Amino acid sequence: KQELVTQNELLKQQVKIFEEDFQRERSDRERMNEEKEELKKQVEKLQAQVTLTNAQLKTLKEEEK
Amino acid sequence: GSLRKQELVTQNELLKQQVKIFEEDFQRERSDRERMNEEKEELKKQVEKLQAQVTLTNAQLKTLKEEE
Amino acid sequence: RKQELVTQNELLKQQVKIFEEDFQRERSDRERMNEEKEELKKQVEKLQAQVTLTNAQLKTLKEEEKAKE
Amino acid sequence: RKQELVTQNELLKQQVKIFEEDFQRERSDRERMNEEKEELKKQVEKLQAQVTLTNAQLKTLKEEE
């Protein structure tokens, strides 16, 4: 009994920590994903600007002729 | 007495399988975190370079418009 | 200047190979430091929870003494 | 062939220029990250002091009974 109860209390506590850690990690995996999503939207906006500015320069050179 | 130990034995094996799965999840969760952090460092580097392209082409606009 | 270019292009081709090897080395170092920061973040959450844990025990003790006063 | 070598030569020199510019950019980013790690170290060190302090206040408070 004595070895069996000790291990039962050990593993129950072990799992108790993993579960807490697992839920803590959901929060961290959620935060990091959104941060990435913010960095993707920043890139997407700049990609539009680069396309526009090149077009404006192309039009302005063409108007110069 | 015998039932209580059988119940523990059974419970202890289920917990050693639960511990095994959480430890597999852990190292799996580490590699994802590593992957997603690197992707952020690539996306930040893109922004640096994309901002550079905007300032480059806006400078070119400035110079033409003033030279005109 | 033809042979000068042939010599230089070979030597630059070697230099680009080293730069490319430096780059993947810089990736590995960046990745090591980023996870070390994530290992430190989780330690902060662990430590804060432990502060919370003891402060609860403090509060309970003090509150339980208030009743017995 | 010499035309082909001069093109090649310009591209390799370009390649090198970008590697040398990425090199120097990375130094700043690593230095930034390395300080951000120091800020997180300092926050661990502060909290470890509080964990030690709270445990010791709990111990003396129980002794006060």
Whether C9 sits inside 8 A of D13 (CB atoms) is no
Give chain A positions within 8 Å (CB) of C45.
24
CA distance B39 to B42: 5
Q: Which residue of A has its CA nearest to C46?
A: A21
Binding-site residues on chain C for chain B (CB distance < 8 A):
27, 30-31, 34-35, 38
Task: Show which subunits contact D, needing at least 3 CB pairs below 8 angstroms.
Answer: C
CA distance D44 to D40: 6
What technique determined this structure? Answer: X-ray
* Inter-chain Cβ pairs, chain B and chain C, closer than 8 A: 16
CA A29 to chain centroid, in Å, comes to 6
CA dihedral D43, D48, D50, D52 (to 10 degrees): -170
Question: Could you tell me the residue ranges of all domains in chain C?
Answer: 1-69
| Residue of A16, A13, A4 whose CA lies nearest to B12 | A4
Resolution of this deposited model, Å: 3.0
| Residue of B15, A17, D58, B55 whose CA lies nearest to C61 | D58
Whether residue C30 contacts residue D30, with contact meaning beta carbons closer than 8 Å, is answered with: yes
Give φ, ψ of D64 to 5 degrees: -65, -5
Burial of A48 (0-12, 13-18, 19+ CB in 10 A): exposed
CA distance D58 to C57: 8
Q: How crowded is residue B20: how many other Cβ atoms within 10 Å of its Cβ?
A: 10
Whether residue B57 contacts residue A53, with contact meaning beta carbons closer than 8 Å, is answered with: yes
CA C3 to chain centroid, in Å, comes to 48
Closest CB to A14 among B19, B54, B60: B19
CA distance C27 to A62: 43
Mutation site, C19, C23, C31, interface D, largest D CB count within 10 A? C19
